[PDB]
Assembly symmetry: D2
Homo-oligomer: 120 residues x 4
């Protein structure tokens, strides 16, 4: 089985820590991004998400509320377990910027990927 | 101030209810999609997310754990208020499918938009 | 049959003209965006793409080389015809910004939608 | 400088060959995908795109018209040259499926990434 609980790093060097996954698949945690628009402002930020529970290789999503920005990121992906028991989270994300009004909405959403592996 | 608590519909005819937003910006709710890969299977599905609290037009994210599929969707966006006090959630989403192993990961993520308005 | 040759406008107020589609489905055209990072700089910009030829409601893609920015946008979508013969291009786009080096790549891609209808 | 002309492979094993880039930045080529929904049907497929010309690390876009599917992919990205002169294309893509009518449009667009390096 693949549970999101534990510490992970991604290909950009970011670290996240996920706490216990409850029987609904809900989890909370923290996210320390390695990069930001203004990296001098980065602080540890909370995340909240849901994974599927029954599946051995569950899909999941989570939201990161950046504590140093008005932006928000969502990640979604799947936890894969390989033939040696190694786990990888394959994810894609949307990063929503805050803009002043709806005329700027078109430019407010970035997209990308991240691959996560366990810290230990 | 643009509020997320309440009942919403989107341009595809889906509806969602969002409960009280706590001091950390966290909220739960229930999502009824109007469309699915297998629409005969649609059931009500829980959502869990975070919005920014201070901002008048906050960004936010949430995860929908589909209760009838192995897939997961994440939505992110911003709540805008126009001159007459009418709210719109401008959102983008990623829909993650479950695939068998990492070699199929490339085809597992769909993207789209949704605009939500308040029900009555 | 849903045709791409002609003049189109989208939900942001941008317009484009598309020239004759050749036997391989290839087409050129000119794009006038209604919005930009620096809207004072907007100039007409060339587009180049390919549609499917046989299909009545073809999928297609095109690239817009912005003539006033180092960025590039790609659009992909499908041309639909309703019961009355009215056409709509349902599209999604990626907008690539120029960044200084690969360590900034994560923030360089924006995503969004556009719906196009025929001008008159 | 970074010109797209030449042969490239990506992280999925796909190969593309780009021909001469003209003075407008337009280029054509072919794309042999390693993966598809129906890999038994894969055939070499044409691409058409535009890069920026003046920039040492240009952004670009291209469209692949799959010759074995009704789908279309667009790629956009940037060519980076590192301190040793090695080139990498960092890209993201949208893959548009053909659906029967507009009621299915919501599920028709996949998103992903690819990193390309030169074959030789
Ligand atoms: O910088 C931010 C907040 C931090 C985002 C980190 C992103 S989350 C996707 C990716 N994966 C990671 O591990 N880290 C990155 N937001 C922001 C950036 C730029 C602008 N802007 O206006 O340019 C506005 C908000
Ligand atoms: O059908 C599903 C689950 C329901 C997804 C509804 C989407 S969420 C984005 C959009 N906005 C809405 O309000 N509703 C739609 N998932 C799914 C679909 C197709 C496949 N597939 O393999 O084709 C696998 C899983
Ligand atoms: O402004 C630009 C170039 C023009 C892009 C217009 C976009 S194409 C998707 C959408 N549909 C339209 O019809 N028009 C918009 N690029 C740009 C924007 C912002 C930044 N930035 O750094 O913030 C860099 C480059
Ligand atoms: O399979 C296809 C056509 C080939 C797409 C190859 C993609 S392009 C992005 C990525 N990078 C690569 O180098 N290769 C992959 N299209 C398709 C797939 C599935 C469905 N479907 O309905 O499930 C419809 C069309």
């Amino acid at each position: 089985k693949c549970s999101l609980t534990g510490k992970w790093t991604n290909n950009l060097g970011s670290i996240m820590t996920i706490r216990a996954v409850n029987s609904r698949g809900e989890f909370t945690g923290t996210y320390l991004t390695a990069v930001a628009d203004n990296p001098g402002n980065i602080t540890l930020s909370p995340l909240l998400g849901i994974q599927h529970k029954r599946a051995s290789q569950p899909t999941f999503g989570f939201t990161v509320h950046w504590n140093f920005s008005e932006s928000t990121t969502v990640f979604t992906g799947q936890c894969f377990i390989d033939r040696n028991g190694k786990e990888v989270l394959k994810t894609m994300w949307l990063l929503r910027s805050s803009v002043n009004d709806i005329s700027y909405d078109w430019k407010a959403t970035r997209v990308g990927y991240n691959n996560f592996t366990r810290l230990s």
